[PDB]
Amino acid sequence: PMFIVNTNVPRASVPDGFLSELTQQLAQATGKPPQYIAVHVVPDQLMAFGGSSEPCALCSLHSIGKIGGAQNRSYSKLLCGLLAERLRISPDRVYINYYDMNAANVGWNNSTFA
Amino acid sequence: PMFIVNTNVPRASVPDGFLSELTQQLAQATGKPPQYIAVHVVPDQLMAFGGSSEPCALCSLHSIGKIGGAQNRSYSKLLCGLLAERLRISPDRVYINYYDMNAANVGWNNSTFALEHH
Amino acid sequence: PMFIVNTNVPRASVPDGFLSELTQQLAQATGKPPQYIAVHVVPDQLMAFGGSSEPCALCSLHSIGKIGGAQNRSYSKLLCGLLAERLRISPDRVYINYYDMNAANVGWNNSTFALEHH
């Protein structure tokens, strides 16, 4: 799986341990091994949410399976919680796009997961 | 909805008011409340379009519904128009990927927009 | 088509000509004219793959058609080979998301690639 978070919060406000916490908690939540979890954090972005430049985040989580109604609500509670606690971003200023990827549509190690 | 624009145009060339104009015009175009419109502009990128590095933009618009044949052509006219007028990017050097998101696949405020079944 | 590469490799490590090489190789692989191939490389990113910050890349390839089981295996061998050769990134630290776009969902030049119906 891969998780990306784009935010206008400054890089200095990202705490030590963040990428590792995201990796471990997403491994727990998705049921996938941590060695297959990739994370990308993009601070200092020029963005607005509702026309306001208060802290916000636009994110995405891609996974082959383990994407659905209840699961996505669980991922959103987990991720909004981390973004609130660690980056001080209000949950109502976060959007997370979820993608259930077909294994044939994910390349890795010179081939695909199909 | 969320609209992202990635471009090689310098940050200095983005005019004051641009994020607000995109927010307001997308609210008008999609019929969605402006309070729910998010925008992200990424300048100074290393990109090429057709192998040339003249000004260009690669964008995306994600919305739960309001994505379709005629609507997407209307959004493209609006957005290419704004990118040409404000960032001086030629419309034929702009790609915009449209995504019709299912409500269950959009997280917000500790949950998603699928609040009907559990 | 559009190909995006996000990596933690430093900008100085992206060779001159890399965008052009990707453009040419992708035009060849997809059969699409190079004039329609867009590439975006984003170095110096804060990323981890499997909990490690050694070189890695998260990428995407969007194309209207020319996306499928065998074609994607071929694109992966091609692209991982280029990322390994040019950016020194191990293929097992590379993910590439493939998207088969509908023509009506790709905006370009004030409209979309759905020009047949109203």
GROMACS .gro file of C-alpha atoms in nm:
model
  350
    1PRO     CA    1   0.000   0.000   0.000
    2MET     CA    2   0.102   0.362  -0.038
    3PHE     CA    3  -0.013   0.661   0.164
    4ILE     CA    4   0.051   1.021   0.055
    5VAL     CA    5  -0.026   1.336   0.257
    6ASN     CA    6   0.006   1.684   0.105
    7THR     CA    7  -0.023   1.967   0.354
    8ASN     CA    8   0.043   2.339   0.398
    9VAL     CA    9   0.184   2.273   0.748
   10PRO     CA   10   0.557   2.371   0.755
   11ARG     CA   11   0.821   2.097   0.741
   12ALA     CA   12   0.954   2.200   1.084
   13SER     CA   13   0.616   2.104   1.232
   14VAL     CA   14   0.646   1.741   1.116
   15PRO     CA   15   0.768   1.546   1.424
   16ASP     CA   16   1.050   1.295   1.438
   17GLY     CA   17   0.895   0.949   1.401
   18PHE     CA   18   0.607   1.051   1.175
   19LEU     CA   19   0.691   0.846   0.867
   20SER     CA   20   0.756   0.542   1.091
   21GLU     CA   21   0.431   0.584   1.285
   22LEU     CA   22   0.238   0.606   0.957
   23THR     CA   23   0.413   0.296   0.822
   24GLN     CA   24   0.347   0.087   1.134
   25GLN     CA   25  -0.010   0.201   1.192
   26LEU     CA   26  -0.109   0.152   0.828
   27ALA     CA   27   0.048  -0.196   0.840
   28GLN     CA   28  -0.173  -0.270   1.141
   29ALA     CA   29  -0.483  -0.122   0.985
   30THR     CA   30  -0.460  -0.275   0.639
   31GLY     CA   31  -0.333  -0.613   0.748
   32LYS     CA   32  -0.043  -0.586   0.503
   33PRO     CA   33   0.324  -0.640   0.604
   34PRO     CA   34   0.506  -0.320   0.701
   35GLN     CA   35   0.785  -0.391   0.448
   36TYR     CA   36   0.530  -0.332   0.171
   37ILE     CA   37   0.398   0.000   0.309
   38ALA     CA   38   0.523   0.317   0.137
   39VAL     CA   39   0.461   0.668   0.275
   40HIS     CA   40   0.520   1.014   0.129
   41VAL     CA   41   0.476   1.335   0.328
   42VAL     CA   42   0.468   1.669   0.145
   43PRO     CA   43   0.478   1.976   0.371
   44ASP     CA   44   0.491   2.348   0.294
   45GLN     CA   45   0.238   2.320   0.012
   46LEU     CA   46   0.038   2.606  -0.137
   47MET     CA   47  -0.318   2.492  -0.066
   48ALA     CA   48  -0.659   2.597   0.056
   49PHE     CA   49  -0.959   2.410   0.194
   50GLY     CA   50  -1.293   2.590   0.180
   51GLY     CA   51  -1.104   2.898   0.063
   52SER     CA   52  -0.899   2.914   0.384
   53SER     CA   53  -0.525   2.862   0.432
   54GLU     CA   54  -0.559   2.728   0.788
   55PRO     CA   55  -0.380   2.390   0.820
   56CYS     CA   56  -0.532   2.124   0.596
   57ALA     CA   57  -0.434   1.806   0.415
   58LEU     CA   58  -0.516   1.629   0.089
   59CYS     CA   59  -0.423   1.261   0.097
   60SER     CA   60  -0.454   0.929  -0.079
   61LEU     CA   61  -0.430   0.562   0.022
   62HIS     CA   62  -0.382   0.299  -0.253
   63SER     CA   63  -0.412  -0.071  -0.164
   64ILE     CA   64  -0.475  -0.392  -0.356
   65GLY     CA   65  -0.789  -0.487  -0.167
   66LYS     CA   66  -0.868  -0.401   0.195
   67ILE     CA   67  -1.061  -0.096   0.063
   68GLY     CA   68  -1.433  -0.068   0.141
   69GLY     CA   69  -1.705   0.105   0.339
   70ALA     CA   70  -1.625   0.009   0.697
   71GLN     CA   71  -1.251  -0.024   0.637
   72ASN     CA   72  -1.224   0.323   0.487
   73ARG     CA   73  -1.414   0.476   0.776
   74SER     CA   74  -1.164   0.302   1.010
   75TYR     CA   75  -0.865   0.430   0.807
   76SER     CA   76  -1.008   0.784   0.814
   77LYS     CA   77  -1.049   0.779   1.192
   78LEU     CA   78  -0.691   0.652   1.229
   79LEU     CA   79  -0.538   0.896   0.980
   80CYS     CA   80  -0.737   1.205   1.080
   81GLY     CA   81  -0.639   1.123   1.437
   82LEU     CA   82  -0.269   1.112   1.349
   83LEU     CA   83  -0.292   1.431   1.144
   84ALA     CA   84  -0.467   1.611   1.430
   85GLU     CA   85  -0.230   1.488   1.699
   86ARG     CA   86   0.095   1.522   1.504
   87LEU     CA   87   0.039   1.807   1.258
   88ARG     CA   88  -0.243   1.991   1.443
   89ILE     CA   89  -0.474   1.971   1.141
   90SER     CA   90  -0.851   1.967   1.209
   91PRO     CA   91  -1.018   1.645   1.084
   92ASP     CA   92  -1.278   1.853   0.900
   93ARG     CA   93  -0.997   2.001   0.690
   94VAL     CA   94  -0.869   1.667   0.564
   95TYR     CA   95  -0.970   1.474   0.251
   96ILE     CA   96  -0.836   1.123   0.185
   97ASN     CA   97  -0.899   0.957  -0.155
   98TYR     CA   98  -0.910   0.575  -0.129
   99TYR     CA   99  -0.816   0.356  -0.426
  100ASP     CA  100  -0.877  -0.019  -0.444
  101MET     CA  101  -0.611  -0.116  -0.694
  102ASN     CA  102  -0.631  -0.418  -0.922
  103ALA     CA  103  -0.313  -0.624  -0.871
  104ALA     CA  104  -0.241  -0.608  -1.246
  105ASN     CA  105  -0.240  -0.228  -1.212
  106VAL     CA  106   0.043  -0.202  -0.956
  107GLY     CA  107   0.401  -0.235  -1.079
  108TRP     CA  108   0.678  -0.345  -0.842
  109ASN     CA  109   1.016  -0.514  -0.883
  110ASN     CA  110   1.016  -0.526  -1.266
  111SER     CA  111   0.667  -0.682  -1.288
  112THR     CA  112   0.323  -0.639  -1.130
  113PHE     CA  113   0.143  -0.794  -0.833
  114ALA     CA  114  -0.086  -0.994  -1.061
  115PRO     CA  115  -1.411   1.829  -0.453
  116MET     CA  116  -1.037   1.870  -0.484
  117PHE     CA  117  -0.840   2.027  -0.768
  118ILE     CA  118  -0.463   1.988  -0.800
  119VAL     CA  119  -0.239   2.171  -1.052
  120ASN     CA  120   0.127   2.076  -1.100
  121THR     CA  121   0.324   2.313  -1.322
  122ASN     CA  122   0.676   2.417  -1.420
  123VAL     CA  123   0.568   2.785  -1.411
  124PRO     CA  124   0.765   2.962  -1.131
  125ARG     CA  125   0.598   3.037  -0.797
  126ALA     CA  126   0.661   3.409  -0.858
  127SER     CA  127   0.432   3.392  -1.160
  128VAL     CA  128   0.130   3.271  -0.961
  129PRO     CA  129  -0.086   3.577  -0.905
  130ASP     CA  130  -0.235   3.689  -0.576
  131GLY     CA  131  -0.591   3.556  -0.562
  132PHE     CA  132  -0.533   3.241  -0.765
  133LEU     CA  133  -0.628   2.983  -0.502
  134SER     CA  134  -0.941   3.184  -0.421
  135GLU     CA  135  -1.041   3.217  -0.787
  136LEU     CA  136  -1.005   2.840  -0.839
  137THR     CA  137  -1.208   2.773  -0.523
  138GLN     CA  138  -1.488   3.007  -0.623
  139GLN     CA  139  -1.504   2.904  -0.987
  140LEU     CA  140  -1.500   2.533  -0.905
  141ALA     CA  141  -1.782   2.584  -0.652
  142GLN     CA  142  -1.983   2.753  -0.927
  143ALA     CA  143  -1.901   2.486  -1.186
  144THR     CA  144  -1.961   2.174  -0.976
  145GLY     CA  145  -2.257   2.305  -0.779
  146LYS     CA  146  -2.081   2.197  -0.458
  147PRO     CA  147  -2.049   2.431  -0.157
  148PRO     CA  148  -1.728   2.638  -0.161
  149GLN     CA  149  -1.662   2.526   0.201
  150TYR     CA  150  -1.601   2.176   0.060
  151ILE     CA  151  -1.371   2.276  -0.228
  152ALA     CA  152  -0.995   2.215  -0.176
  153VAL     CA  153  -0.722   2.336  -0.408
  154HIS     CA  154  -0.349   2.266  -0.431
  155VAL     CA  155  -0.107   2.448  -0.663
  156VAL     CA  156   0.243   2.310  -0.712
  157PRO     CA  157   0.478   2.541  -0.905
  158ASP     CA  158   0.845   2.519  -1.005
  159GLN     CA  159   0.815   2.154  -1.105
  160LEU     CA  160   1.050   1.954  -1.325
  161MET     CA  161   0.816   1.855  -1.609
  162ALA     CA  162   0.786   1.816  -1.984
  163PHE     CA  163   0.490   1.798  -2.219
  164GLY     CA  164   0.565   1.651  -2.561
  165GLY     CA  165   0.933   1.647  -2.464
  166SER     CA  166   0.942   2.029  -2.433
  167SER     CA  167   0.982   2.219  -2.109
  168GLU     CA  168   0.782   2.529  -2.205
  169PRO     CA  169   0.500   2.610  -1.955
  170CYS     CA  170   0.262   2.320  -1.901
  171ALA     CA  171   0.037   2.171  -1.633
  172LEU     CA  172  -0.074   1.825  -1.523
  173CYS     CA  173  -0.387   1.842  -1.305
  174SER     CA  174  -0.660   1.642  -1.146
  175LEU     CA  175  -1.016   1.708  -1.031
  176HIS     CA  176  -1.177   1.455  -0.790
  177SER     CA  177  -1.549   1.491  -0.711
  178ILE     CA  178  -1.821   1.264  -0.573
  179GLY     CA  179  -2.049   1.281  -0.875
  180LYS     CA  180  -2.078   1.577  -1.117
  181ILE     CA  181  -1.819   1.408  -1.342
  182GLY     CA  182  -1.918   1.313  -1.695
  183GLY     CA  183  -1.897   1.380  -2.067
  184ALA     CA  184  -2.037   1.729  -2.097
  185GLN     CA  185  -1.953   1.839  -1.745
  186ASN     CA  186  -1.585   1.747  -1.788
  187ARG     CA  187  -1.566   1.939  -2.119
  188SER     CA  188  -1.712   2.240  -1.934
  189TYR     CA  189  -1.460   2.202  -1.651
  190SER     CA  190  -1.175   2.181  -1.900
  191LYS     CA  191  -1.279   2.500  -2.078
  192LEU     CA  192  -1.301   2.676  -1.743
  193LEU     CA  193  -0.974   2.546  -1.602
  194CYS     CA  194  -0.764   2.576  -1.919
  195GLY     CA  195  -0.905   2.928  -1.948
  196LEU     CA  196  -0.785   3.013  -1.597
  197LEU     CA  197  -0.444   2.850  -1.650
  198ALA     CA  198  -0.396   3.042  -1.976
  199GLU     CA  199  -0.513   3.375  -1.833
  200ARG     CA  200  -0.334   3.352  -1.499
  201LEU     CA  201  -0.026   3.137  -1.557
  202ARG     CA  202   0.013   3.194  -1.932
  203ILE     CA  203   0.001   2.820  -2.004
  204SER     CA  204  -0.128   2.714  -2.346
  205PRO     CA  205  -0.444   2.499  -2.321
  206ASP     CA  206  -0.285   2.240  -2.548
  207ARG     CA  207  -0.009   2.186  -2.289
  208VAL     CA  208  -0.253   2.100  -2.010
  209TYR     CA  209  -0.382   1.753  -1.906
  210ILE     CA  210  -0.655   1.719  -1.641
  211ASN     CA  211  -0.747   1.376  -1.504
  212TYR     CA  212  -1.107   1.360  -1.380
  213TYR     CA  213  -1.208   1.117  -1.109
  214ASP     CA  214  -1.568   1.037  -1.019
  215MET     CA  215  -1.519   0.926  -0.660
  216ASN     CA  216  -1.756   0.690  -0.481
  217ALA     CA  217  -1.874   0.838  -0.151
  218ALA     CA  218  -1.733   0.539   0.041
  219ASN     CA  219  -1.391   0.611  -0.105
  220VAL     CA  220  -1.352   0.965   0.028
  221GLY     CA  221  -1.237   1.020   0.385
  222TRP     CA  222  -1.320   1.337   0.577
  223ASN     CA  223  -1.372   1.436   0.941
  224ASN     CA  224  -1.279   1.098   1.096
  225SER     CA  225  -1.503   0.898   0.863
  226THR     CA  226  -1.612   0.902   0.494
  227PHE     CA  227  -1.909   1.022   0.296
  228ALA     CA  228  -2.070   0.675   0.318
  229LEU     CA  229  -2.276   0.736   0.635
  230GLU     CA  230  -2.582   0.531   0.535
  231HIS     CA  231  -2.486   0.171   0.607
  232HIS     CA  232  -2.273   0.011   0.877
  233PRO     CA  233  -0.016   0.956  -2.146
  234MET     CA  234   0.133   1.099  -1.830
  235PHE     CA  235   0.407   0.948  -1.615
  236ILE     CA  236   0.491   1.082  -1.270
  237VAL     CA  237   0.789   0.982  -1.051
  238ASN     CA  238   0.807   1.089  -0.686
  239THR     CA  239   1.139   1.005  -0.523
  240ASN     CA  240   1.368   1.087  -0.230
  241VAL     CA  241   1.672   1.089  -0.462
  242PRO     CA  242   1.826   1.443  -0.471
  243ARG     CA  243   1.767   1.675  -0.766
  244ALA     CA  244   2.140   1.672  -0.848
  245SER     CA  245   2.113   1.295  -0.901
  246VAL     CA  246   1.846   1.326  -1.172
  247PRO     CA  247   2.047   1.324  -1.494
  248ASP     CA  248   2.017   1.588  -1.761
  249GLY     CA  249   1.806   1.437  -2.035
  250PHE     CA  250   1.604   1.216  -1.801
  251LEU     CA  251   1.268   1.374  -1.887
  252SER     CA  252   1.346   1.340  -2.256
  253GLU     CA  253   1.454   0.978  -2.221
  254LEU     CA  254   1.132   0.894  -2.036
  255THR     CA  255   0.931   1.073  -2.306
  256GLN     CA  256   1.096   0.880  -2.586
  257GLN     CA  257   1.084   0.541  -2.414
  258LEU     CA  258   0.720   0.584  -2.316
  259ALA     CA  259   0.619   0.692  -2.667
  260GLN     CA  260   0.782   0.373  -2.793
  261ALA     CA  261   0.622   0.150  -2.527
  262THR     CA  262   0.267   0.283  -2.552
  263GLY     CA  263   0.263   0.348  -2.925
  264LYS     CA  264   0.133   0.700  -2.858
  265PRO     CA  265   0.297   0.998  -3.032
  266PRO     CA  266   0.562   1.175  -2.820
  267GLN     CA  267   0.375   1.503  -2.862
  268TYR     CA  268   0.113   1.356  -2.631
  269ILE     CA  269   0.347   1.217  -2.362
  270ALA     CA  270   0.382   1.422  -2.039
  271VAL     CA  271   0.642   1.352  -1.771
  272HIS     CA  272   0.691   1.492  -1.421
  273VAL     CA  273   0.982   1.405  -1.190
  274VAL     CA  274   0.970   1.510  -0.823
  275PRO     CA  275   1.299   1.463  -0.639
  276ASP     CA  276   1.407   1.544  -0.282
  277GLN     CA  277   1.087   1.404  -0.135
  278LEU     CA  278   1.032   1.296   0.226
  279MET     CA  279   0.944   0.931   0.178
  280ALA     CA  280   0.988   0.582   0.312
  281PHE     CA  281   0.933   0.236   0.162
  282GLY     CA  282   0.898  -0.049   0.411
  283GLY     CA  283   1.007   0.187   0.687
  284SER     CA  284   1.338   0.273   0.518
  285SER     CA  285   1.444   0.602   0.361
  286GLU     CA  286   1.698   0.445   0.122
  287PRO     CA  287   1.625   0.546  -0.240
  288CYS     CA  288   1.273   0.462  -0.352
  289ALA     CA  289   1.007   0.587  -0.592
  290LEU     CA  290   0.627   0.605  -0.603
  291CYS     CA  291   0.499   0.655  -0.957
  292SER     CA  292   0.192   0.657  -1.173
  293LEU     CA  293   0.125   0.601  -1.544
  294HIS     CA  294  -0.210   0.727  -1.684
  295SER     CA  295  -0.309   0.637  -2.039
  296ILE     CA  296  -0.632   0.619  -2.238
  297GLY     CA  297  -0.610   0.250  -2.318
  298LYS     CA  298  -0.285   0.054  -2.363
  299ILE     CA  299  -0.311  -0.053  -1.997
  300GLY     CA  300  -0.352  -0.418  -1.905
  301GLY     CA  301  -0.197  -0.728  -1.751
  302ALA     CA  302   0.082  -0.796  -1.999
  303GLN     CA  303   0.136  -0.437  -2.104
  304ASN     CA  304   0.176  -0.329  -1.743
  305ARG     CA  305   0.431  -0.604  -1.678
  306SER     CA  306   0.628  -0.470  -1.976
  307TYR     CA  307   0.599  -0.107  -1.859
  308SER     CA  308   0.720  -0.209  -1.513
  309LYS     CA  309   1.030  -0.384  -1.644
  310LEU     CA  310   1.100  -0.083  -1.864
  311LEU     CA  311   1.043   0.184  -1.599
  312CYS     CA  312   1.209   0.004  -1.309
  313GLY     CA  313   1.506  -0.055  -1.539
  314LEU     CA  314   1.529   0.315  -1.612
  315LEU     CA  315   1.488   0.414  -1.245
  316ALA     CA  316   1.764   0.169  -1.147
  317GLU     CA  317   2.002   0.275  -1.424
  318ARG     CA  318   1.945   0.650  -1.399
  319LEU     CA  319   1.850   0.719  -1.037
  320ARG     CA  320   2.010   0.414  -0.874
  321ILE     CA  321   1.681   0.299  -0.719
  322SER     CA  322   1.631  -0.073  -0.657
  323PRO     CA  323   1.333  -0.217  -0.848
  324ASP     CA  324   1.199  -0.366  -0.526
  325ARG     CA  325   1.170  -0.015  -0.383
  326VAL     CA  326   0.955   0.111  -0.668
  327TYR     CA  327   0.573   0.114  -0.693
  328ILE     CA  328   0.394   0.225  -1.011
  329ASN     CA  329   0.019   0.273  -1.015
  330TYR     CA  330  -0.139   0.220  -1.362
  331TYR     CA  331  -0.459   0.398  -1.462
  332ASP     CA  332  -0.663   0.314  -1.772
  333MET     CA  333  -0.836   0.646  -1.829
  334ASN     CA  334  -1.168   0.687  -2.011
  335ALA     CA  335  -1.138   0.944  -2.290
  336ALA     CA  336  -1.423   1.149  -2.136
  337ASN     CA  337  -1.219   1.176  -1.815
  338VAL     CA  338  -0.909   1.340  -1.959
  339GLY     CA  339  -0.919   1.713  -2.022
  340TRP     CA  340  -0.690   1.881  -2.277
  341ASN     CA  341  -0.703   2.196  -2.492
  342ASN     CA  342  -1.027   2.339  -2.345
  343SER     CA  343  -1.222   2.013  -2.380
  344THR     CA  344  -1.162   1.638  -2.334
  345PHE     CA  345  -1.080   1.341  -2.561
  346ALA     CA  346  -1.453   1.263  -2.580
  347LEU     CA  347  -1.536   1.459  -2.897
  348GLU     CA  348  -1.792   1.223  -3.046
  349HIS     CA  349  -2.110   1.279  -2.844
  350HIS     CA  350  -2.304   1.558  -2.678
   0.00000   0.00000   0.00000
